[PDB]
C-alpha cells in the first residue's frame, strides 16, 4: 500500500519508487521530484498525513541532515 499517495496533475496522485527522483525537506513540508513517464514533476506532504514509505525515503535523509 506504500508507494507514495499524494496531489499532482489536479487529482490524487500515487507513485512507485522507480520513478522518484528526489526528496528533501522545503523547510515544513515534505517535498519530492519524481518522474512521469520521463518528465519530472513536484510531490509534497505534510507529516501528520505521510504515511511510512514516504517517510522512510524522507527519513534517512532528515535524519542525516539533522
Avoid at 27 to 48: L, Q
Wanted: proline residues 2%; charged residues 45%; aromatic residues 8%.
Amino acid at each position: 500500500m506504500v508507494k507514495v499517495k499524494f496531489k499532482y496533475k489536479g487529482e490524487e496522485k500515487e507513485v512507485d519508487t522507480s520513478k522518484i527522483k528526489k526528496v528533501w525537506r522545503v523547510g515544513k513540508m515534505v517535498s519530492f521530484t519524481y518522474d512521469d513517464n520521463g518528465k519530472t514533476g513536484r510531490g509534497a506532504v505534510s507529516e501528520k498525513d505521510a504515511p511510512k514509505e514516504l517517510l522512510d525515503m524522507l527519513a534517512r535523509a532528515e535524519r542525516e541532515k539533522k
